[PDB]
Structures are given as structure tokens and as C-alpha cells.
Amino acid sequence: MQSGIIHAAEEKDWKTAYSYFYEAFEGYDSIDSPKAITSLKYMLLCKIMLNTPEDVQALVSGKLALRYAGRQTEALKCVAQASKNRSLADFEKALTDYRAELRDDPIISTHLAKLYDNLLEQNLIRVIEPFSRVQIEHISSLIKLSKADVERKLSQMIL
Amino acid sequence: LGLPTEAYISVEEVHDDGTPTSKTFEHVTSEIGAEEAEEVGVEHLLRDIKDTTVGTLSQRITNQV
Amino acid sequence: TFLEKTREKVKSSDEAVILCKTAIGALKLNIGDLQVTKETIEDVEEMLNNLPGVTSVHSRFYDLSSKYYQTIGNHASYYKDALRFLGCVDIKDLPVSEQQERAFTLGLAGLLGEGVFNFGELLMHPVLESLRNTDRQWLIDTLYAFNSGNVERFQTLKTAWGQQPDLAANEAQLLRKIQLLCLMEMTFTRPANHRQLTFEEIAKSAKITVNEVELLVMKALSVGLVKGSIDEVDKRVHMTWVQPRVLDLQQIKGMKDRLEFWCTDVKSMEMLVEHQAHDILT
Amino acid sequence: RRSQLKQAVAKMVQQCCTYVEEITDLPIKLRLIDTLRMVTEGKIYVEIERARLTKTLATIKEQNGDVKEAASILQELQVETYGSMEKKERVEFILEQMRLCLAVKDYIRTQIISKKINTKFFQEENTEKLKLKYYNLMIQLDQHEGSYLSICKHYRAIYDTPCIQAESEKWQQALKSVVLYVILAPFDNEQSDLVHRISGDKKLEEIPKYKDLLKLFTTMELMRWSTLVEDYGMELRKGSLESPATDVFGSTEEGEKRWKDLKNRVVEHNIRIMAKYYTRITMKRMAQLLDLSVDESEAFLSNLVVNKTIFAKVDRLAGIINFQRPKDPNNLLNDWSQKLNSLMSLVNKTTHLIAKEEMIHNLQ
């Protein structure tokens, strides 16, 4: 587990850091249920950090993780569902509902801000997609966000 | 300046204007097909002219002239 | 009961079922067309065994279809098969007052139906056109008015609504029919340079408002009589393909002359070929 | 065991059949807890397991079932499918408990045990109602989430088995169910010939309404929604066919899901052929042909081109949207070269056709 903690504490190779928490959970399987259920959190946070949201629901629907149902595995399906539909407001309601286990852990409190920036631009290329020339005053009105910061954030995209 | 082998087909019609019993031939497309055994004999009996060596000018004469 | 006696006792080399089913349907003139008269025309449709011009039962099978399709049906199955009922004799050896009434019965069928868009070959059909020359001008004139494609000449025969049955029930789609034939003509009339008419010209040439001409052309594209595109902000349409019509000995003069200087254009460009690429191949 | 267990242990449960209706629940669940011990080693296990089924059914029926004892049948459901080769009575047992799973409100359990019997067909030839029970349990598994197209082959299969052909008014609500999914299904090639699989039918077109409904979606542009609801939003009570239309009306949350999805298919039916036949149309014009807000019109085209099922390039400054308008770098000359080969095939069509026409007038 902590081979994957410190290697993900610098955010260099998420794929190999994912592989530590996989083996950290396979050792915890059916012998230590307190340490096993927290191990699903670090593999699926990294998988959202890997930006493959559909594979989160693919794992927990598998019969190995169907035994380990709980609150925190529902806390990861919804955040993956928030990133699946690629929306900001979808992410906000998922935080407030499950806040006591999502925004409580010491590393999640470090990883949500970088996860927010990826998902900020992800809805931003979704709503800008269907058209041609358009105003900036509607895209601030369709994200429910300001204009000055969005104009800078749009300017980072073309740079 | 073409391929002097014609073939038709038989079609009949109880139709528009001519006769109660009407029947007129219709030309189906026609060409001379080849075969591996006969291309030995066909290309042997010519010995006259055969503008092969297809380069930049076989197309110029078989289909552009 | 006597028919099925004759149906079973005729076993000759002459086909029995072609005359007996037409004898069934001729006996079903009394009552009923949903079960037996239908199965006359539905069953016998393919038993014509390699004999075009079966003039004994060529007319009888087709006269049975004429009486059955003038009976409950659309208009137009009557209008199609009767061309082969009236397409088997040249000296009709019967009073022409019948044939001009039969053609007038056929003239009502090619008008009220929906799938009928010809008005050029039935018009140039030289056995029934002059047959009703001075009797009923108003039917022949409104045939011209469809090929004239105008809202105006159809209004001229609005004083002559002869044969008041089958008339006001279809009056909504008679007015739809003239607005649809109006676009075929001007697309054929305009040259292949542009053929790009506007909606205001349709509102001029069919006197119909702006909010319906888009519904008019989508019907024209769906039926398939025209193939083009539709703009909406520049208020124009790019018509490309139109339905081919018929023509007299005057439009071949245009097709003679537009073809004729296109002959020497094949001569002129190939003249460069055999003169510049001459030494490439003897 | 040699032809002596049959009259021995089945006679023990012949007694228990008489006491499950007579004796009180106290000694007989001691009878059951003393008879489920022998189930594993020596009991009904020769081939006659379908009398063991009614006594493991009898465990549920003493309390008349609840949520949890309905799930207590799971240990013996799939097992004796391997127990004895039999076509009907084994199926009658195993299609039961899924209705209990619906009372559990569990769909993932239901379709797994439904997966056993969809290959175990061809027992309908003796049963006039039991195959009909397999279908009536398989609506609600498909009715619930969004599956308006898994019910496709389902509803033709309750136009099936020849009980249905001779209950003319119950046959009418079979025609209701055979028509209210083809519209409601999301668009597919399978829907595009499902309209043909239901058409060409002699006895479907007896209803003059519903012949016109499928006529609307084979044909051209639809009258908008309000000029259709005044001509077809009233027949849903009339006739002798009200109950699947009441199944639209009755649960109003099922109605609101079926009002708006019927609205969804007809607001879309414009957008298919408006892309097909138009080149460039204004924003104000299209929102008027949908009879709703211009903002609500933009929300419709947003979630359809992120579906990329209809391509569009809309505008919100001049309101100028356009359909199927790419850059076309190479398709100009490419489609031009196609027009040559269509033309050169056409000049060859008439060329060998004229020379025979002279041969039938001036031959000899």
C-alpha cells in the first residue's frame, strides 16, 4: 500500500502506482475487511486520476468487489459517474452527499484540487463543442461560473 | 473502331403501345474473354504487332488517342 | 352452381381458370366485392402462361379489373390497368359515344388520385384526345393547365365544374396538385446555368404564402419528382434534378443544336492529341 | 433405493401436503427442519425433485412469504435444473421467484435467473398460459429503466401463441402493445425495419388510427406536436383497447415518462429530415416548428451532436445553423468524377439501344 502512497505522493507514474494498490488489495482479500475496503479507494481514485471513468464501474460490478459493498464504494461510483457525464455541477452534488468519507482522507484533500482542473476543462470542451462563433456570456451562463477567469481559462487552451 | 461482336437478349412485353404480343431484342454488353491455354495460341498466331510494354504511353493510345 | 359445373368439366388444353374466374367476377356484379371479387383479381394475376394478347380473356380480365377498381379502391389502379384494357384494339368497332364516356370515366380517375403525375403521355395518347374534342373542352383544358402549371387557368374552369360528384371532396388536394406541378415546369424552363428560384417567385407563380412553400417542397422531395437542396436564410433553393417530361418536334430542335457544336468540341480537343503525341506512337 | 424409495419418501411428503393445510405451523416447521437434513443424502433425489419443489415452496407459504424468505429459495433454484431432464414443471418452478425478486425490487437478480430460461424455450407447445407467464414477468424487468427496445421481440411474442388469436377484444390490446414501442424505441436500424416487420399485416390495419400512426413515421415531416395531439390524444380512451393506453395514463410518473418520450421522438423526427433536406436554416424558424423556447431548442441540438447522431454547426449571434456542412477539400472533384462515370455509363446506354430500333422498321 505505502509503496503506492509515496509513489503517488509525487504524481509521476500513476499506472505503476495503481499496480501497487492492486497487489495491496489482493493481499488484504478476505482476511482483513477494514484494510480491504479502504484499498478500493486508492485504486479507483487513481483510475479517475488515470482518466478512465468507465473502468471504475467495470471493476466494482465484478464479482470480486460485489462482495465488498459499502458506503465508500458508492462514494466512488458517483464521482466516476460525475466524471463520466463530464460536468462540473454533476461533480458538486457528488461531493456534498458523501462528504464525510470523500472529503475526509488526508490524501484525497490533496488530490481533489488537481482532479478539479481536469474536470473543469472536460465540461468546457463539451459545451463549446456543438457550434461555431458564440458569445462568452452564455458559456459563463451555462457553466454557472464567472467571465474573467473563464476567459483566462479559455486563453490557456489556445496557448 | 470497336469490338465487332454483338449479342442480344430475348424480352417480351404485354405493354405500352405497339402490339398485344410484343417482343424486341435488347443488347447485353459483349467482349472477348481470354483463357490461359488459348493465350498461348492467340499470342502465337498474331506475330504482327502488339504494342505492349505498358509505360507512360500505353494508356495514351489505348484510351487517350 | 352452374359455373362450378362448367369450371370442372372444362379440362381442355385451353386454360379453364382464366375464363371461369372472370366468369366468377362477372357474376359478382350483383353484390359483394370484399371476399370473392377480390380473390378473383388477387388469385388470377400471374396465370398468363406465355401468351401476350390473350384477346378472349385479355379484355375480360381487364374489364373485370376496371369495374372492380372503379369500385372501392383509390382512383388509380383503375387508371393504370385500363390502359391495357384500351391498349389491345385499333378499330374499336363500337360506338364512340361509349368510348368518349369510358375515356371521361378514365379522365376522372387520373385527376383525383395522388400518385398520378404524368399529364404528357396520356395527353399525347392519340385515341382518346380528339375523341372528346368539342364535347367536353373543360377537361382537356385543365389537362393543359397542369402542364401550364398556373393557378390562373385552373381558376378559369372553376366556373365549369362539370360532374359535381367526386369534386368537392378532393378540392383541397386539387389545389395542392397545381402548386406541385408549378415547380416542375419552371425548373425545366430555367437553363442548367442556375435553375435557382426563390421563395418569393413561388409566392408569385403560385400565389401561396411564405409559411407553406417549405412544406410544399419537402413533399416534392419526398415523392421524388424533384431532387435539390433547400436554403432558408437567403430564401432560395438549389434545384438540381427534375422529372423528365415529354416534348414535341420543336424541343428536339434545341437538342439538335446544343448537341451539334458539341460534336466539333470533341474534334477540336482530340486534334491536339494525334498531332502532338503523333511521334509517341506511329 | 431400488424402486422402494419412491413410495417411501414421496409418501412422507404426501403426508406433509395434508398437514400444510391442516396442522398448525409449530410442529410442521419442526417437520421441515427434520426433512431438509435428509434432502442432501437420501430423499427425493432419484428424479422426482419436482415434489421436493413444492415442499421447499411450502417453507415460504407457511408465513405466506416475506422479503427475506423469498430470497431463501435461492439455494435450490438452479440446482435441480441438472436434476432431471423435464421440459415444463422445472420451468414453472424457476420462473416463479423472479416475481418475488420484483417484490424485493431487484433487477440484477432477476435477469440472471431469467438468463436460464431464454434458451429453455420450446415448451410452449403444451402450455397455453405458462409461456405467456414468462413474458408477463419479462415486461417489468424491461419496462423499468429505459429498455424500450428489448420489448420489441417481446411484444410480437405476445402477438404469438394461438390462444391470443381468438380473444378479439383482448387481441385489440395486443395490438396496442404491438404499436406503442416501435415509436417509443430509440432510433436504430432495428427500428428502421421494425416498422416493416409490423407493416404488411392484414389484420393490424383494422384499427384506422394505428395504421396512420406508423404511416406518420415512414413518411415525411410531421405536424408539429399540438396539431397531432388534438387528433390522437383522445382515442386513448376509446375503442375496446384502453388498458395499455391506461398503462400510459394511469401511473402518471409512467405517463410523464411516456408523454415526454413521445414528445422526444417527434421533436427528433423533424431533426432527422431537417438535416436531410435543408442546407441552412435560421434559429428562430426551427424553434417555431418545435413550438417551444429558443433556449430549449438549443438544448435539444446540444445532446444530439455530442451523441454525433446528427451533425450540426449552430450559431448564437446570427442564429444561422446549417446541416451537413464540412469543409469538403477533396469531395468536390471526387463527387465530380462520380458524375462522369454516371454520365459515361448513360451515353453507352442509348448507343447500343438506337441501332436495334432501326432494325424493326427498315429491316428487309
SS3 letters across D283-350:
HHHHHHCCCCCHHHHHHHHHHHHCCCCCCECECCCCCEEEECCCCCCCHHHHHHHHHHHHHHHHHHHH
8 Å CB contact of D219 and C221? no
Which DSSP helix (H) or strand (E) runs through C230? strand C226-231
Angle CA C48–C51–C57, to nearest 5: 65
Which DSSP helix (H) or strand (E) runs through C241? strand C237-242
Q: Characterize D257-280 residue by residue with b for buried, 16 or more Cβ atoms within 10 angstroms of its Cβ, and e for exposed.
A: ebeebbeebbbebbbeebbebbbb
Torsion angles phi and psi, residue D318, rounded to 5: -110, 0
Q: Which residues contact D224 (CB under 8 A, 6 or more apart)?
A: D289, D290, D291
Query: What's the rounded Cα separation, in Å, for the pair D69 and D71?
Result: 5
Angstroms from B58 CA to nearest CA on chain C: 9
Contact D248, D180 (CB under 8 A): yes
Contact D214, D199 (CB under 8 A): yes
Beta bridge partners of D282: D320
Categorise residue A83: left if φ over 0, alpha if ψ from -120 to 50, beta otherwise. alpha
Helix (H, G, I), strand (E, B) or coil at C195: coil
* DSSP state at residue A134: -
Angstroms from B25 CA to nearest CA on chain D: 8
* DSSP state at residue D44: S
Query: What's the rounded Cα separation, in Å, for the pair A13 and A50?
Result: 10
Q: Characterize A72-109 residue by residue with b for buried, 16 or more Cβ atoms within 10 angstroms of its Cβ, and e for exposed.
A: bbebbbbbbbbbbebbbebbeebbeebeebbeeeeebe
The percent helix, strand, coil of chain C (3-state, each to 5) is 55, 5, 40
Angle CA D235–D241–D243, to nearest 5: 100
8 Å CB contact of C215 and D221? yes
Categorise residue D122: left if φ over 0, alpha if ψ from -120 to 50, beta otherwise. left
Touch test A–B: 3 Cβ pairs or more under 8 Å: no
8 Å CB contact of B14 and C55? no
8 Å CB contact of D313 and A132? yes
B6 lies within 8 A of chain C by CB: no
Q: Which residues of C touch B20 (CB under 8 A)?
A: 52-53, 55, 58, 87-88
Beta bridge partners of B12: B23
Q: Which residues of C touch B15 (CB under 8 A)?
A: 84
8 Å CB contact of D352 and B27? yes
Beta bridge partners of C236: C198
8 Å CB contact of B51 and C87? no
Q: Which residues of A touch D310 (CB under 8 A)?
A: none
Cα–Cα distances (Å) from C180 to C39, C114, C126, C246, D225, in that order, read 37, 11, 26, 18, 25
Indicate if the alpha-carbon torsion angle D157, D158, D163, D168 is positive or negative: negative
C-alpha cell at C194: 442556375
8 Å CB contact of C273 and B65? yes
Tell which of C226, C233, C240, C259 to mutate to test the D interface (max D CBs under 10 Å).
Answer: C233
Query: What's the rounded Cα separation, in Å, for the pair D181 and D178?
Result: 7
Query: What's the rounded Cα separation, in Å, for the pair A34 and D258?
Result: 46
Query: What's the rounded Cα separation, in Å, for the pair A139 and C4?
Result: 82
8 Å CB contact of C218 and D221? yes
Cβ pairs B/D, distance under 8 A: 11
Q: Which of B12, B15, B64 sits opposite C273 (nearest CB)?
A: B64
Closest alpha carbon within chain C to B49: C282
8 Å CB contact of A138 and D313? no
B17 lies within 8 A of chain D by CB: no
Closest alpha carbon within chain D to C224: D220
Q: Which residues of B touch C55 (CB under 8 A)?
A: 20
Tell which of D273, D277, D322 to mutate to test the C interface (max C CBs under 10 Å).
Answer: D277
Chains touching C, CB cut-off 8 Å, 3+ pairs: B, D
8 Å CB contact of A130 and D317? no
Angstroms from A77 CA to nearest CA on chain D: 17
Q: Which residues of A touch D313 (CB under 8 A)?
A: 130-132
Closest alpha carbon within chain C to D222: C215
8 Å CB contact of D278 and C221? no
Query: What's the rounded Cα separation, in Å, for the pair B22 and C84?
Result: 13
Helix (H, G, I), strand (E, B) or coil at D137: coil
User: 202-231 in D: which are within 8 Å (CB) of C?
Assistant: 219-221
Long-range CB contact pairs, D21-29, < 8 A, 24+: D25/D62, D25/D63, D28/D62, D29/D59, D29/D62
Query: What's the rounded Cα separation, in Å, for the pair D188 and D148?
Result: 12
8 Å CB contact of C281 and B57? yes
Angstroms from D271 CA to nearest CA on chain A: 15
Residue position matching grid coordinates 459563463: A140
Torsion angles phi and psi, residue D186, rounded to 5: -70, 155
Rounded to 10°, the helix D49-61/D6-19 angle is: 20
C-alpha cell at D34: 427434520
Helix (H, G, I), strand (E, B) or coil at A150: helix
Query: What's the rounded Cα separation, in Å, for the pair C139 and D46?
Result: 89
D343 lies within 8 A of chain C by CB: no
Beta bridge partners of D322: D280
Chains touching B, CB cut-off 8 Å, 3+ pairs: C, D
User: 286-325 in D: which are within 8 Å (CB) of C?
Assistant: 320
8 Å CB contact of D302 and A135? no
Ordered DSSP codes for C47-110: ---S-S--HHHHHHHHHHHHHHHHSSS-SHHHHHHHHHHSSS-SS--S-HHHHHHHHHHHHHHH
Query: What's the rounded Cα separation, in Å, for the pair D143 and D166?
Result: 27
Q: Which of A130, A132, A134 sits opposite D305 (nearest CB)?
A: A130
Cα A133 to chain center, whole Å? 32
Which DSSP helix (H) or strand (E) runs through C238? strand C237-242
Cα–Cα distances (Å) from D12 to D2, D23, D291, in that order, read 17, 15, 73
Residue position matching grid coordinates 462563433: A133
C-alpha cell at D55: 415442499
Query: What's the rounded Cα separation, in Å, for the pair A19 and A4?
Result: 8
Query: What's the rounded Cα separation, in Å, for the pair D154 and D136?
Result: 9
Touch test A–D: 3 Cβ pairs or more under 8 Å: yes
Tell which of D106, D283, D302 to mutate to test the A interface (max A CBs under 10 Å).
Answer: D302
Exposed, middle or buried: residue C172 (CB in 10 Å: 0-12, 13-18, 19+)?
exposed
Closest alpha carbon within chain A to D304: A130
Which DSSP helix (H) or strand (E) runs through D206? none
Exposed, middle or buried: residue C209 (CB in 10 Å: 0-12, 13-18, 19+)?
exposed
Long-range CB contact pairs, C240-244, < 8 A, 24+: C240/C195, C242/C184, C242/C187, C242/C188, C242/C195, C243/C117, C243/C184
CA atoms within 13 A on the CB side of C212: 8
Q: Which residues of C touch B60 (CB under 8 A)?
A: 277, 280-281
Q: Which of D306, D312, D315 sits opposite A126 (nearest CB)?
A: D306
Closest CA to C273 of D337, C281, B51, B3: C281
H helical segments located in D208-251: 208-218, 226-232, 242-249
- Residue type (1 letter), D364: Q
Where along chain C do its domains lie? 1-239
C-alpha cell at D82: 441438472
8 Å CB contact of D306 and A129? yes
D342 lies within 8 A of chain C by CB: no
